[PDB]
Write a protein that binds this DNA or RNA. Structure first.
Ligand SMILES: [Mg+2]
Ligand SMILES: [Zn+2]
Ligand SMILES: [Zn+2]
Lengths: 98, 70, 104, 240, 421, 48, 145, 344, 303
DNA sequence: GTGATATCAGCCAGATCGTGCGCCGGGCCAATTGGCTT
DNA sequence: AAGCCAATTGGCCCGGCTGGCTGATATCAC
């Protein structure tokens, strides 16, 4: 991932990899006793924002060809209520197989 | 073929038995006997719709007593 | 793929637990002889009045007092506006003229 | 004119209330006996009509059902989770087309109550009652009588009946045949080295089909310490 | 053929090796496309037919080892040839093979075929050598079992080569076997799959050929835009008049003598007339032969028992004509079991036994007039079935396969029987 | 038996779980116990 | 619970008593969800007092929020504390101001109402849809006298 | 349809509002027109997401005659008589290329020489023959005029003095029936053979030796081939590869004659003859609708001279200007240990 | 008689039987209404007049009621005209007509003839008000209050006018400046007015599915997660067993493992009969004990 | 633990005037009329 | 001239626009 959290051009991805890093806030929630006890053990304070990053689906591979990013604050004509958009292109060469 | 148990599991604990899917997963993971199937959710949805149509659908036990499906 | 969620939440709490906080049953009755009991937490303020969702009528406690509540604002009718706009003598003379024409 | 001249000696009514009154004061056994006598003595098309009528007259005569059940005073309401209001990503809400019909019923019923307790000419009350009955009819069966109601895009709404009938109803699509777990699909090639009782699965499909079993097995052999590490190990696709 | 179905009197005198000219290729595209479209539609037609067949006979399962019945069907083997020497009948593999003998066969005081045997080619060859032409075999049509059918009447299970077990679902097997070759049957009178659909639905054929009712003399009447055949029986009863159209091709001349069920015109007999005039056995034979003709035309082999299951399912009810005092309204179809038991109860402490007539009905009507409202609702016409059951307050006992499948419990067949569990 | 060609056809795989389902799939539905055809009794699992 | 005990499936003609015995409460308003907080509106089609809580072991106002408070009707809002899955099992009902016919027993040929009352379908349709009157009673003896 | 609502609104507001303060700008509301245009171009059964497997697929998606859609008919209501190959389709609609699913007969392809009339009918060209002499006058004829005349066959042996030889020529008559006739009644002749076959069906060598079903399958299956990284034109093809590839619009063609000035895998700048310079850009590893790759090669060199219409860059599945959907492989016909058993 | 499948036509043909009215007729009808109402009130008063006076009083009351009914039946046509003016956008024609009828009833209730003005305009005001209120309160599945509906309508009108005059889609800043509100408010108002889609909308050409058949249930119990949580609970109970009885007990009663009820330090000390700070000391010791590089690895994975 | 003030939501009213929504096949039932029957 | 026994045809259904006034809520503060 590069400075703004978008995969680098030329990187090779495999199933489960992260293409774009995204964080979504979730607000106040109550954890189960076991989870709270485990957090107390390891002392990992909750961040209150979960991850919704974009990952390659199962059974997909290939290099990264292009990354196109649109910002609603850069004059792009994004639809209402869409701050930012990003598109990532993955290409792979297939040989003939049974 | 005459295979009743395979059909019953293909219809209950693989599609609709909401409380049975987790139980069967736990049974497989812990290495023990698969539990008996329950009653599928689609039947309950059908009964609810039929009752919503002002039809008095009810299931009876050996004696003429309703079960009420929870 | 399409992702959508109903505005619902789920919890891992076992619900088998080890003990439940004590509750008290308060009894109510209907005007047609239908009766029921409602469970409330002991640390609670009992409401003197309830709605029997079994029969859809107002219900009071077995031994509670019977309160009286008046209308916050009575539903305005035609007659109220007629006093508001027309004077008493105007209505009196209108009625007199109407009675005269009816008699004639 | 007849009412103001001969108001007494008879009671008249209009709408479903008249049918309810007639069904309440109905002598079923007398009608059944009359139909039986006509069948025995009379002949012709009258005999066939009486035979057809006795089938529906006799049912209520003996069984626990009563005719008054054909007219409704209160209408049941299906649980909300069977008519969900789901929130799609982006704020768009998706409904189930039964909320609209229920809302029509409730709105028209409330307006009817307002008109009745307010005092209105018979024309308005009768029109409101007709609209309420049509709303209930559309709720139960849509398009059976008159023209079906439509939403955006001018396509008929789905009613309670439509969910049980047809090739896409509850009975045929969700009950007699369903989707199942632990299932895979793929294109077949030919292997002539196999025996008559053998098949060849690709290892991706086999691994995804047998995931719990392999997790338990590799936990057993100490290839992992717990089911969490076993699941991560299977997902990452190691060698062992 | 042309775009319309009619031969073009100019052939394609060139094979695919020598190459076709432009016009010949264009002419061939006609038949090519027509065949492709017929192939496209046959799939849906056969699927619908098989669904109906499965629905009518889902609950026909084996539930006994032997009913002890002494009855059966007289099946013919070893049709006599033109040389005076018995020759085995052509269709013995699908008529008498995999079937049992109702009664022992004795010729010249020798038992050459004991009762209740598989009746393979060895026994048939021995019987033909001994010089017999008829055998009284056991069929489901004549099973006296109280519950369902029994293994000995069904006979051998063709899928395994041994006696059918006591939990087999023979009805579904019969439905599937009859319905599978539907796509192979390439679609005045119906010829292909529509002919089978017509036969199993007990419909009136297209080219209806009236069949005489009483033996006697026949006379023909001539009039414009009409023809009539009047039959005077030898018994002297009233005349019988059959009207027909001008185009109809006659088969019996004026003053000729006719049999009880002899045809009086070229066409297709309708099952109802043959039933009413010659009993249940005649209609059974007619239906089996007519159904097997369509399949044999395309070289499809299906055993007779599979069709016999459907046929017996189609003849399960009797229509009441005489009121009697059995509480059965006239004109109300009733299962023969209910009618028989009601008559038995009435004859005791009663005077009038109700009388009825056999009724032949199609697979759709038979499968919709069932005793379980759940299966009927799940078949088709859901709204009508439900609004009828609600008024009748019908109670479903869950004794079939579809009901148990719907509610999610062990089907009462195969390994789900309490005998094995 | 499957009426399956090798010009792009696809097939589905299901996994029995319980002991009863496995016993049925192993004793009743096995591939090498189904030589004959239920319709008429002629073999279908035959060199073609 | 156990399908092995299902003995029969009986269908009947539901009456008002059955309809309002199934219901856990009467829905008397047409609102579904608040446009801002997205929470069910009271007495609406999605109310929680009638159809159950929307969150496991939690009431509408939030006074009770734990599994310990199980099976307690929060006096503040009336919602009980239990699993949200009960929203798939609880029915409500609407009390009509005037009676209504069931379309199934009116239109489905043969019209069962017509056969039972011996009324032609056109006459019955006229009566129910407020197009003509209907004499439901008459004093034969008194009028003759 | 949009303008109908627009003018209804215009007249209503003109009547309702005042006068002497009204101008055309404040009477015309163009919302309905744009709304109708948007509705048509989106969620309409005739505005289809394009097919971009290869140049042939794109070219065949155009030239497609669909008999179903808004105002047409339905898939399940069409009978067995509207899907037939009526004898009036000769030269106007292909009888081979149609879908094999439940759409058989309801979608077709325009023939190679077909043309659309002013009223929407389809015309086809015929060479006029007078007094048994095949002239060089081409007349475009519709179905009715074709029924009026008697049409000869494309491959009719001639004496080479523009005159028929055998005196017994197979010709089509009023009802589409074929018959032998003398060389005096004939009045029209086909312009060429393969006048009745579509563009995709004209690229199957030895088509006259193939059953109609197999030719139909081959035509429907040539539209699914994917473009490979290295293209190679067929060794034994038809004469219709270059024309199809160039007319499909996926081959870069010079606009004006000139000499290539500078060249690179991304661009070609040519100095036209009239003094102006023009630079052409090439797609490299783009993406088509179907997920394949669009990539254009260069077939010219720096010193070459190019005339207008010359091909300067290949396409996704072309090789030097002509369609190339596959590769030439050395094939042997024999069974081999059962690995090629039953169509493998 | 002759009920049709189009109730609108039947209602329209039924409301035309009664004729219209004139200004003098309306004035005298209002006079009759007022006289009847006043006479009915006077009768309702306790004092009792002569029987004949009460009889004529009832007669005039009946006449006034009939006059009111006639007036409403006459103005039904005006109600229908306003309704058809407001037709569309959410409500059916008959619903609008009924709301207009209620508004007309209110207008007749709140009407005075002293002004001498034609009764039509007052009823028009009231009918329009009632129809607008009802439409704002019943035209959406997710109800929006009247003021927010007004804001949404004004924003839509301004946006349409800007699009027409300018010829280009207005950017949010332009609308914010013209409407005199922040861009965030404009965005929120835009997001409020959207109408929901249906789960039964077909999406495939064949029609084998609906739009609601691919909506993933994002609030169900994933069996893998449930079994993982159960294994975590078992492992936690096993690990807490290795500790001493006192330490495990204090941890359990501090995090409420057994009952789910967290407890304060003082209560724990009370049950243990020790100081609050001492109890706090024990919790820290156990917390560090579990977070050690000798017992952590049995619990690291589950975190 | 309160406490002031802004929005948040629901309800009510105005007067000139204004008066009519915007494909096929198969099975069955019911209305009509020819032709008897009295 | 009234009533009934049939045929005939038509139809239906089912299978593939400001404004004012008041109490409750919240949101920042003490
Ligand atoms: Mg294949
Ligand atoms: Zn038997
Ligand atoms: Zn609460």
């Amino acid at each position: 991932l590069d400075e703004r959290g978008i995969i680098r051009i030329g990187a090779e991805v495999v199933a489960g990899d992260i293409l774009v890093g995204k964080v979504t806030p979730k607000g106040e929630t109550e954890l189960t006793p076991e989870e709270r006890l485990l957090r107390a053990i390891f002392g990992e304070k909750a961040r209150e924002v979960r991850d919704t990053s974009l990952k390659v689906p199962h059974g997909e591979i290939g290099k990264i060809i292009g990354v196109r990013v649109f910002d609603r604050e850069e004059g792009d004509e994004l639809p209402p209520g869409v701050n930012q958009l990003v598109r990532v292109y993955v290409a792979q060469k297939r040989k003939i197989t049974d | 073929y005459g295979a009743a148990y395979a059909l019953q599991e293909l219809l209950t604990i693989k599609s609709d038995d909401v409380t049975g899917r987790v139980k069967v997963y736990e049974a497989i993971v812990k290495g023990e006997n698969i539990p008996e199937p329950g009653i599928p959710e689609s039947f309950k949805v059908l009964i609810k719709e039929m009752q919503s149509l002002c039809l008095n659908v009810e299931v009876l036990s050996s004696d003429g007593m309703s079960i009420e499906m929870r | 793929a399409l992702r959508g969620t109903r505005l619902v939440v789920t919890s891992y709490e076992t619900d088998r637990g080890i003990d439940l906080a004590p509750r008290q049953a308060v009894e109510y009755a209907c005007e047609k002889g239908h009766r029921f009991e409602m469970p409330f937490s002991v640390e609670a303020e009992i409401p003197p009045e309830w709605e029997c969702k079994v029969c859809g009528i107002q219900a009071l406690l077995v031994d509670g007092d019977g309160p009286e509540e008046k209308k916050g604002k009575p539903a305005r009718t035609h007659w109220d506006m007629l006093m508001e706009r027309r004077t008493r003598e105007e209505l009196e003379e209108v009625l007199a003229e109407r009675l005269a024409v009816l008699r004639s | 004119e007849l009412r103001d001249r001969f108001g007494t000696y008879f009671d008249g009514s209009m709408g479903a209330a008249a049918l309810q009154k007639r069904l309440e004061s109905f002598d079923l056994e007398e009608e059944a006996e009359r139909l039986r006598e006509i069948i025995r003595t009379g002949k012709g098309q009258k005999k066939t009509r009486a035979l057809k009528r006795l089938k529906v007259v006799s049912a209520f005569l003996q069984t626990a059902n009563s005719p008054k059940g054909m007219v409704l005073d209160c209408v049941p309401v299906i649980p909300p989770d069977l008519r969900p209001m789901v929130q799609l990503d982006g704020g768009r809400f998706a409904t189930s087309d039964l909320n609209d019909l229920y809302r029509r019923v409730i709105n028209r019923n409330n307006r009817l109550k307002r008109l009745l307790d307010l005092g209105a000419p018979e024309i308005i009350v009768n029109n409101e009652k007709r609209m309420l009955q049509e709303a209930v009819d559309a709720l139960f069966d849509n398009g059976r009588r008159g023209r079906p109601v439509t939403g955006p895009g001018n396509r008929p709404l789905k009613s309670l009946s439509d969910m049980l009938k047809g090739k896409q109803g509850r009975f045929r699509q969700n009950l007699l045949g369903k989707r199942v777990d632990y299932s895979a699909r793929s294109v077949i090639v030919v292997g002539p080295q196999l025996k008559l009782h053998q098949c060849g699965l690709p290892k991706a499909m086999a691994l995804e089909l047998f995931k719990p079993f392999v997790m338990k097995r590799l936990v057993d052999l100490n290839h992992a310490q717990n089911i969490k590490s076993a699941k991560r190990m299977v997902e990452r696709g190691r060698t062992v | 053929s042309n775009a319309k179905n009619e031969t073009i009197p100019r052939p394609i005198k060139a094979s695919f090796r020598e190459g076709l000219t432009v016009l010949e290729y264009f002419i061939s595209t006609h038949g090519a496309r027509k065949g492709l479209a017929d192939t496209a539609l046959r799939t849906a037609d056969s699927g619908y037919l098989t669904r109906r067949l499965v629905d009518v006979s889902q609950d026909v399962i084996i539930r006994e080892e032997d009913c002890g019945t002494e009855r059966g069907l007289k099946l013919r083997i070893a049709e006599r040839g033109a040389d005076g020497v018995l020759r085995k009948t052509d269709d013995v593999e699908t008529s008498v093979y995999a079937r049992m003998l109702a009664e022992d066969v004795v010729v010249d005081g020798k038992v050459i075929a004991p009762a209740n045997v598989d009746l393979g080619d060895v026994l048939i060859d021995a019987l033909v050598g001994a010089g017999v032409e008829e055998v009284k075999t056991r069929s489901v049509l004549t099973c006296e079992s109280a519950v369902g059918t029994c293994a000995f009447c069904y006979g051998r299970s063709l899928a395994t080569g041994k006696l059918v077990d006591i939990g087999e679902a023979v009805g579904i097997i019969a439905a599937q076997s009859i319905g599978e070759p539907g796509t192979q049957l390439t679609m005045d009178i119906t010829q292909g799959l529509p002919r089978v659909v017509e036969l199993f639905e007990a419909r009136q054929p297209k080219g209806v050929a009236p069949i005489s009712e009483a033996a006697g003399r026949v006379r023909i009447e001539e009039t414009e835009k009409t023809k009539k055949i009047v039959v005077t029986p030898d018994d002297g009863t009233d005349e019988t008049a059959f009207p027909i159209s001008k185009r109809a091709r006659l088969l019996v001349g004026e003053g000729d003598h006719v049999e009880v069920g002899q045809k009086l015109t070229v066409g297709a007999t309708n099952p109802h007339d043959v039933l009413r005039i010659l009993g249940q056995r005649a209609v059974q034979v007619h239906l089996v032969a007519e159904v097997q003709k369509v399949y044999n035309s395309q070289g499809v082999s299906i055993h007779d028992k599979h069709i016999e299951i459907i046929i017996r399912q189609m003849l399960r009810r009797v229509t009441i004509i005489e009121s009697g005092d059995a509480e059965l309204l006239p004109g109300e179809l009733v299962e023969r079991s209910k009618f028989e038991t009601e008559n038995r109860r009435v004859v005791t402490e009663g005077g009038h036994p109700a009388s009825g007539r056999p009724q032949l009905m199609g697979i759709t009507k038979a499968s919709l007039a069932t005793e379980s409202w759940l299966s009927a609702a799940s078949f088709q016409e859901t709204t009508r079935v439900l609004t009828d059951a609600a008024i009748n307050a019908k109670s479903d006992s869950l004794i079939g396969l579809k009901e148990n499948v719907i509610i999610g419990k062990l089907i009462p067949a195969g390994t789900g029987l309490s005998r094995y569990r | 038996a499957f009426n399956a060609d090798f010009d792009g056809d696809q097939m589905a795989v299901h996994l029995p779980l319980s002991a009863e389902a496995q016993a049925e799939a192993r004793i009743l539905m096995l591939s090498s116990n189904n030589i004959l055809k239920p319709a008429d009794g002629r073999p279908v699992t035959m060199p073609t | 619970d156990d399908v092995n005990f299902f003995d029969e499936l009986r269908i009947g003609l539901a009456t008002a008593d059955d309809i309002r015995q199934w219901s856990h409460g009467e829905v008397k308003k047409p609102e579904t969800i608040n446009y801002r907080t997205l929470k069910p509106e009271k007495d609406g089609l999605f109310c929680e007092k009638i159809f159950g809580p929307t969150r496991d072991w939690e009431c509408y106002c939030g006074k009770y929020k734990r599994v310990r408070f199980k099976g307690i009707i929060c006096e503040r809002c009336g919602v009980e504390v239990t699993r949200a899955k009960v929203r798939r099992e609880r029915m409500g009902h609407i009390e009509l101001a005037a009676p209504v016919t069931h379309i199934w027993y009116f239109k489905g040929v043969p019209s069962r109402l017509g056969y039972l009352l011996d009324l032609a379908p056109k006459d019955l349709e006229k009566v129910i849809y407020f197009a003509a009157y209907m004499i439901t009673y008459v004093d034969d003896e008194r009028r003759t006298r | 349809t949009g303008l109908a609502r627009m003018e209804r609104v215009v007249r209503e507001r003109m009547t309702t509002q005042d006068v002497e303060a009204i101008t055309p700008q404040t009477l015309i509301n163009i919302r309905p027109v744009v709304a109708s245009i948007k509705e048509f171009f989106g969620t309409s059964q005739l505005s289809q997401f394009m097919d971009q497997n290869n140049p042939l697929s794109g070219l065949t998606h155009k030239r497609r005659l669909s008999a179903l859609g808004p105002g047409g008919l339905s898939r399940e209501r069409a009978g067995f008589e509207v899907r037939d190959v009526h004898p009036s389709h000769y030269g106007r609609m292909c009888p081979i290329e149609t879908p094999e699913g439940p759409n058989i007969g309801l979608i077709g392809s325009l023939a190679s020489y077909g043309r659309v009339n002013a009223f929407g009918f389809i015309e086809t060209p015929y060479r006029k023959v007078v007094d048994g002499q095949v002239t060089d006058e081409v007349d475009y004829v519709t179905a009715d005029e074709e029924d009026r005349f008697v049409i000869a066959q494309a491959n009719a042996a001639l004496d080479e003095e523009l005159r028929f030889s055998e005196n017994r020529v197979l010709v089509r008559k009023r009802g589409g029936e074929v018959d032998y006739v003398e060389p005096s009644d004939v009045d029209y002749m086909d312009v060429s053979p393969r006048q009745m076959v579509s563009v995709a069906t004209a690229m199957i060598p030895f088509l006259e030796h193939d059953d109609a079903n197999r030719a139909l399958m081959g035509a429907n299956m040539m539209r699914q081939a994917v473009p490979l990284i290295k293209s190679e034109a067929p060794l034994v093809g038809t004469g219709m590869e270059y024309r199809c590839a160039t007319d499909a619009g996926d081959v870069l063609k010079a606009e004006k004659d000139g000499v290539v000035q500078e060249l690179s895998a991304d661009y070609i700048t040519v100095a036209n003859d009239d003094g102006t310079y023009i630079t052409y850009r090439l797609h490299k590893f783009s993406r088509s609708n179907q997920g394949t790759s669009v990539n254009q090669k260069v077939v010219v060199d720096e010193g070459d001279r190019v005339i207008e219409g010359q091909v300067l860059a290949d396409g996704p599945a072309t090789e030097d200007g002509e369609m190339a959907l596959g590769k030439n492989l050395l094939v042997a016909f024999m069974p081999w240990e059962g690995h090629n058993y039953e169509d493998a | 008689a002759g009920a049709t499948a189009d109730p609108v036509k039947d209602y329209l043909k039924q409301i035309g039987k009664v004729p219209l009215l004139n200004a003098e007729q309306e004035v005298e009808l209002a006079k009759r209404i007022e006289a009847g109402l006043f006479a009915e009130d006077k009768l309702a008063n306790s004092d009792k007049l002569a029987p004949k006076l009460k009889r004529e009083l009832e007669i005039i009351a009946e006449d006034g009621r009939r006059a009111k009914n006639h007036l409403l039946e006459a103005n039904l046509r005006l109600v229908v005209s306003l309704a058809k003016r407001y037709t569309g956008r959410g409500m059916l024609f008959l619903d609008l007509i009924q709301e207009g009828n209620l508004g007309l009833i209110r207008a007749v209730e709140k009407f005075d003839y002293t002004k001498g003005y034609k009764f039509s305009t007052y009823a028009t005001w009231w009918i329009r008000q009632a129809i607008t209120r009802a439409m704002a309160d019943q035209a959406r599945t997710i109800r929006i209050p009247v003021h927010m509906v007004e804001v949404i309508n004004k924003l839509a009108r301004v946006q349409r006018q800007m699009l027409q005059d300018l010829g280009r889609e207005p950017t949010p800043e332009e609308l914010a400046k013209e409407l005199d509100m922040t861009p965030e408010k404009v965005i929120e108002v835009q997001k409020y007015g959207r109408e929901p889609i249906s789960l039964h909308t077909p999406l495939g050409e064949d029609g084998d599915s609906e739009f609601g058949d691919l909506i993933e249930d994002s609030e169900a119990v994933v069996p893998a997660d449930a079994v993982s949580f159960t294994l975590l609970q078992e492992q936690l109970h096993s690990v807490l067993d290795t500790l001493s009885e006192r330490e495990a007990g204090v941890v359990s009663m501090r995090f409420g493992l057994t009952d789910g009820q967290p407890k304060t330090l003082d209560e724990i000390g009370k049950v243990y009969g020790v100081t609050r700070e001492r109890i706090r000391q024990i919790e820290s010791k156990t917390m560090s004990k579990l977070r050690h590089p000798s017992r952590s690895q049995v619990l690291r994975d589950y975190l």
